Each structure stands twice: as structure tokens, then as C-alpha cells.
């Protein structure tokens, strides 16, 4: 799995898409996405988000490399029922340049 590079102090607009989460079960089952980790649901909270129905990772705010250089988050894929379909997927986000 490849890290996502985001230049610091981007113009936006925000929120902006960064990368789309894909499961190899997507063709078979309608998959809903959520994220956790420092940057999403623990501090700093709400910097990153995800579009539940599409899997598109969103960045809500411009990133400052002097504050935080790197983020490690977890993607979660569930069915309509709420049943998990995968182990948590690791999401690495590096701030450039």
C-alpha cells in the first residue's frame, strides 16, 4: 500500500479529495467507508475525513509540515449491515515538499 503525498499549505478549496480507498470485494458488495486515527477521530480531530459511499479520502484543512509531518490512519470497510469486510487498512499520509 502506497503512501499519499500532500503538499503543505495547499490552496484548496477544502475539503479536497486525496485518494480513493478500494477493496477487492467492492464488485460483490456495496461497501461503506470510515476512518480512524490521530488526524480523524483523535487529536488533531477532523483534519481528515472520508466519503462514506465512495471511499474518497478527504483533507479538510491546509497541512503544516512544521506542526505535523506525517499521519498514520486506519480505513474501515463495512457492509450495509455494519459488518466489517476487511482488517483495518493502513493509510500513510506524508506532507511535502
Amino acid at each position, epitope marked *: 500500500v502506497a503512501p499519499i503525498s500532500v503538499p503543505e499549505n495547499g490552496k484548496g478549496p477544502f475539503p479536497q479529495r486525496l485518494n480513493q480507498l478500494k*477493496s*477487492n*470485494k*467492492d*464488485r*460483490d*458488495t456495496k461497501i461503506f467507508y470510515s476512518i480512524t486515527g490521530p488526524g480523524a477521530d483523535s487529536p488533531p480531530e477532523g483534519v481528515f475525513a472520508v466519503e462514506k459511499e465512495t471511499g474518497w479520502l478527504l483533507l479538510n484543512k491546509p497541512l503544516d509540515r512544521e506542526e505535523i509531518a506525517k499521519y498514520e490512519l486506519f480505513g474501515h470497510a463495512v*457492509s450495509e*449491515n455494519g*459488518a466489517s469486510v476487511e482488517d483495518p487498512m493502513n493509510i500513510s499520509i506524508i506532507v511535502t515538499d
Partner: single-chain antibody
Framework: QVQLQESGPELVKPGASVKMSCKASGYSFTAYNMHWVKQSHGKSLEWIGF????????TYNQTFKGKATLTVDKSSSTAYMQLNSLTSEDSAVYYCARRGYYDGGFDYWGQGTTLTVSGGGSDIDIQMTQTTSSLSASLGDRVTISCRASQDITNYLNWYQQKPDGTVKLLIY???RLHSGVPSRFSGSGSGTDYSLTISNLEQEDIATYFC?????????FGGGTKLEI
């Protein structure tokens, strides 16, 4: 390497049940969905359904609802299909196949389990027609095999190759992209409702039957196949 070992041939009387195993190895069993398919002599292929071994969610072709029961044993990396209320019409070769990619395709297949025995609903069922059933060409030639869908399937079209073994391989998924280990001389194209597979420099290895399959909508459906001699 990725392997799916299916259990031995079955010979049962009408009215009985039977249960086939499909043992996975060479990958993380729960990270991929497992699909089953039926092939009646000689070569027609029908999609039964799939199980997600992680969640346990199952989806059946309305056709096999009640006839087939899919389960898994996580601790042994084994998928199971039970077939009930058996009749002569259930006599077929049955297959295990792994869901390979986000864009579709079944990337690895078991060798098949032969069953000899001495259902339907309101979903629309996309018809895949391969207009040529049998084709004879020479060694070294280039040859085009065609496939048509009753509906626009937006490039979700895959091609499989079956040898007179029974063994099946994925050649191409999502219209044009090649499964690993598949030589460049196989290539596919198409759009909307019309698709085709092109093989160049025919070899002895290519004597086989080639099947298209749509991955746009449930239930999954296959074409009737095109047989290739010399």
C-alpha cells in the same frame, strides 16, 4: 502460489444432499470473496453465488436459492457448498473461484468437482452471447473471439480460458487488463455492449475454450463459450 484444491468426484442418488470442499492456500483466506459456478456437460457456465469469508455475507443467484448452501471454515481455509434435493439436472462439474480485483474478474479457480446424480426470481439476467461456438484456425495465426451483452456493461467484461482438462484460467479482466503470467499475445478490447479477445501467434497451448463473463450486475453471467481447435 495461489491454489484452490477441490474435493473428489461425487456419485449420489436422487433426493440426497452432497457437500463439496474448496481448500485455499497461498494467500489470506478471509481477504478475498469466494465464488462458485456450475458447468453442465459440455460447456455452459452458470454463476451460483459467493461468500465473504470475513463477514459471512452470502449472495445467491436467484436460480440457486434453496438448492445451494455456502459456508466457510475460517480455521482450515476451506469453503463449502452443499447441494440439496438432488436431481439429474444437478449433474455437473462445479467450481471454486476467487474474486481477484476491485474491477472484477475471478483470478484463480479450483480444478472442479464432478457431481453425477443417477429456483429463479425477478432479477433481470444479462445475456452474454458468443456468436461463434466453434472456431478452427492454424498455428501461428491471429484470431478474434467475440462477446455481446444484452445491456451496456461499462467495460466490466472478463475472459477465461478452459483447457480440455477442466482447468480454468483468467486471461483478461475489466475489458483489457491482463492477469499476471498471461502472455502479451492475449489482448482484449470493447466498450458498452460489444467486446472481443484477440490471441496472436497461436500455440499448441491455446487449444481451449474461451468464455466471456460480465461483472456489471448480479447475477454474474457468462457467454456460451467459443471452442478453439489447432
Amino acid at each position: 502460489q495461489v491454489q484452490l484444491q477441490e474435493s473428489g468426484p461425487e456419485l449420489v442418488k436422487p433426493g440426497a444432499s452432497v457437500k463439496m470442499s474448496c481448500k485455499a492456500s497461498g494467500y489470506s483466506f478471509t481477504a478475498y470473496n469466494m465464488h462458485w459456478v456450475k458447468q453442465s456437460h459440455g460447456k455452459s457456465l452458470e454463476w451460483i453465488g459467493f461468500i465473504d469469508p470475513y463477514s459471512g455475507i452470502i449472495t445467491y443467484n436467484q436460480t440457486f436459492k434453496g438448492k445451494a448452501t455456502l459456508t466457510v471454515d475460517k480455521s482450515s481455509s476451506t469453503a463449502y457448498m452443499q447441494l440439496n434435493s438432488l436431481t439429474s439436472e444437478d449433474s455437473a462439474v462445479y467450481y471454486c473461484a476467487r474474486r481477484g480485483y476491485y474491477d472484477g474478474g475471478f483470478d484463480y479457480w479450483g480444478q472442479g468437482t464432478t457431481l453425477t446424480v443417477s429456483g429463479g426470481g425477478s432479477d433481470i439476467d444479462i445475456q452474454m452471447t458468443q456468436t461463434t461456438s466453434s472456431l478452427s484456425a492454424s498455428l501461428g495465426d491471429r484470431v478474434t473471439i467475440s462477446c455481446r451483452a444484452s445491456q451496456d456493461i461499462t467495460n466490466y467484461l472478463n475472459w477465461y480460458q478452459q483447457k480440455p482438462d477442466g482447468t480454468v484460467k483468467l486471461l483478461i479482466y475489466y475489458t483489457s487488463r491482463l492477469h499476471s503470467g498471461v502472455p502479451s499475445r492475449f489482448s482484449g478490447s470493447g466498450s458498452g455492449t460489444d467486446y472481443s479477445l484477440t490471441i496472436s501467434n497461436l500455440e499448441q497451448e491455446d487449444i481451449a475454450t474461451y468464455f466471456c463473463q460480465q461483472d456489471s450486475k448480479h447475477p454474474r453471467t457468462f457467454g456460451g463459450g467459443t471452442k478453439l481447435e489447432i
